[PDB]
């Protein structure tokens, strides 16, 4: 339905701009004090949004968004990658006061859109950075038909290597897009991270038959697939039968604590294994619960304006706005541009097409 659309495309933007909090939040470390200030302010229900700015993270999402829509039905990849680049470079322009993150903007204005391969970059060790899982969700709107499999991991790969050369970033964008594709396909959430490890393969697959920078890839391919594992295997849902169990404590402190364990080095959500990693957790606690999702996702001491993206986009495509406070998103920041969009993608998501690739 196109209503879910709307909401995935409106609530990622709402859960960026609630995680933000105009800076406030994102650089607060103390989860527990987000949480007495959001209770001052008299809770989720009361926040309302309108001067609530969205952050890069939507910015991007956004612009890969809007390249989706303009390469149009049965697109070229080629013409595709070259609107990816051109809107990743120009929406650099929107990122006042809004905190973007530095492979992102570094690399995005680097990118030489038109000329051949001129959106690639080189491998680098310090790209692993959760920007690219941040504004992938979409390609799963775009994409969500199995017959599109391989087109979603091609696009989500490459989007993400134009500023993410590393596979901890890219494989993140791989995750934000077919997990945003099994939630348009009613797919249940406890199986998602099964889905994830099955297609890593093919993800190496177009990695190494790709031929760029394949040592250096393959050298650190490891870290994403080990940490998606151990985390499957501590909620018991490796094998995607059975539902999660979640530790006896795990209140606002104990999920600050357990973000810093999954973190690279110490910033929990702000990488492409632990963004996407921390809004599934979430959405597997929340169920049918904004309020839950926004507790586990949006409120906490790490990176909480990208995990709150990615998993506003997964529940909205689920539960459209059912039991969301409408001023959580009624005065939202681009919120006319998000919906036009969200109409747009759902005009070519749902009509399956086939793809010209590269
Ligand atoms: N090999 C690596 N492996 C895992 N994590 C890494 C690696 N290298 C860096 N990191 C981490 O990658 C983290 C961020 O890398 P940055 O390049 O600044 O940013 P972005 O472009 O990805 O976007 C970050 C977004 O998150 C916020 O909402 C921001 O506002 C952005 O919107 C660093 O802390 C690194 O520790
Ligand atoms: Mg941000």
Redesign the pocket.
């Known amino acids: 339905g196109s209503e879910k659309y709307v909401a995935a495309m409106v609530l990622s933007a709402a859960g960026?701009a609630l995680?933000?909090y105009n800076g406030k939040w994102?650089f607060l470390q103390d989860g527990e004090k987000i949480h007495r200030q959001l209770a001052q302010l008299g809770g989720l229900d009361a926040l309302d949004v309108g001067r609530w700015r969205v952050?890069?993270?939507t910015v991007?999402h956004l612009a890969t968004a809007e390249a989706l829509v303009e390469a149009g039905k049965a697109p070229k990849l080629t013409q595709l990658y070259y609107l990816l680049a051109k809107h990743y470079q120009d929406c650099m322009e929107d990122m006042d006061g809004?905190?973007?993150?530095?492979?992102?903007?570094?690399?995005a204005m680097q990118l030489k859109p038109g000329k051949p391969n001129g959106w690639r970059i080189p491998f680098?060790?310090?790209?692993?950075?959760?920007?690219?899982?941040?504004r992938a969700m979409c390609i799963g709107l775009r994409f969500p038909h199995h017959s599109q499999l391989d087109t979603l991991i091609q696009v989500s790969i490459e989007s993400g290597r134009m500023?993410?050369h590393?596979p901890?970033?890219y494989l993140g964008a791989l995750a934000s897009a077919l997990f945003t594709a099994y939630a348009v396909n009613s797919r249940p959430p406890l199986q998602w991270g099964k889905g994830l490890m099955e297609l890593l393969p093919e993800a190496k697959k177009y990695i190494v038959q790709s031929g760029y920078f394949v040592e250096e890839n393959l050298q650190?391919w490891s870290?994403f697939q080990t940490k998606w594992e151990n985390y499957l295997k501590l909620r018991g849902i490796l094998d995607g039968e059975s539902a999660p169990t979640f530790p006896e404590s795990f209140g606002v402190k104990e999920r600050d604590q357990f973000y810093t364990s999954l973190?690279?080095?110490?910033?929990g959500?702000?990488?492409?294994?632990?963004?996407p990693m921390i809004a599934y957790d979430a959405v597997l606690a929340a169920g049918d619960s904004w309020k839950e999702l926004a507790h586990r996702a949006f409120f906490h001491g790490g990176?909480?304006?990208?995990t709150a993206?990615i998993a506003g986009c997964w529940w909205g495509v689920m539960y459209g706005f059912k039991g969301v406070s409408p001023s959580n998103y009624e005065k939202l920041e681009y919120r006319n541009r998000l919906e036009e969009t969200a109409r747009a993608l759902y005009s070519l998501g749902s009509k399956e097409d086939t793809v010209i690739s590269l």
């Open positions: 960026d995680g933000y994102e952050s890069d993270d991007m809004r905190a973007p993150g530095g492979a992102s903007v570094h690399n680098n060790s310090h790209e692993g950075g959760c920007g690219a899982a941040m500023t993410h590393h901890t970033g650190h870290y973190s690279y080095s110490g910033w959500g702000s990488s492409g294994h632990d963004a990176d909480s304006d990208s993206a």
